[PDB]
Amino acid sequence: ETPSQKCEEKYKTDKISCLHHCKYQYYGFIDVNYNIAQSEIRKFSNVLMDYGVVDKSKKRELKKVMHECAKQVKKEARKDSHWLNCRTSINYYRCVLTSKLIGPQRFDKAIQDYDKTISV
């Protein structure tokens, strides 16, 4: 009924690492073609701001962190001679939460509350 409930009831067989992207495409953080442009970035940043994970003074720095992470995930994909996929979506997350602008426990708390407000 919510993205997390739908996606985890879906993956039950393998390709379980796609469970992450399945959620983030519903949130709007990653496109359905696995891409991350600035439509997805500003969607990711805004959600973090409405749920008080980051301050409004840090918005432009966080967007840029998201932007530089996106370049990296794509750069690594093309040295492996392919493009974005389930794994790149995870790496985009790992790269973003590397930043010290984001408090982990507030992030996980925000996302889990954001997820409830969506159907299906």
Describe the structure.
This protein is mainly alpha-helical and 120 residues long. It has a single domain (1-120), classed as Recoverin, domain 1. Helices cover 62% and strands 0% of the residues. The chain has six helices and no strands. Helix 1 packs antiparallel against helix 2, helix 3 (38-50) packs across helix 4 and helix 4 (59-79) packs antiparallel against helix 5 (86-96). The longest helix is centred in the middle third of the chain and has 21 residues, at 59-79. It is globular, with a radius of gyration of 14 Å. InterPro entries: PBP/GOBP, PBP_GOBP_sf. Pfam families: PBP_GOBP.
Please outline the helices and strands.
Layout: H1 3-10, H2 19-27, H3 38-50, H4 59-79, H5 86-96, H6 104-116
Helix pairs in contact: 1-2, 3-4, 4-5
Provide a short characterization of the protein structure:
Its main location: secreted. This protein has helices at 3-10, 19-27, 38-50, 59-79, 86-96, 104-116.
By DSSP (H or I, 4+ residues per run), the number of helices equals: 6
- Outline: globular
β-strand number: 0
CATH topology grouping: Recoverin, domain 1
The major β-sheet equals: none
Chain oligomer state: monomer
Indicate how many domains the architecture comprises: 1
CATH class group: Mainly Alpha
CATH homologous superfamily name? Pheromone/general odorant binding protein domain
Distance between the termini: 5 Å
Disulfide bonds: 7-22, 18-86, 69-95
Subcellular location: Secreted
InterPro entries: PBP/GOBP (IPR006170), PBP_GOBP_sf (IPR036728)
Keywords: Blood coagulation cascade inhibiting toxin, Disulfide bond, Hemostasis impairing toxin, Secreted, Signal, Toxin
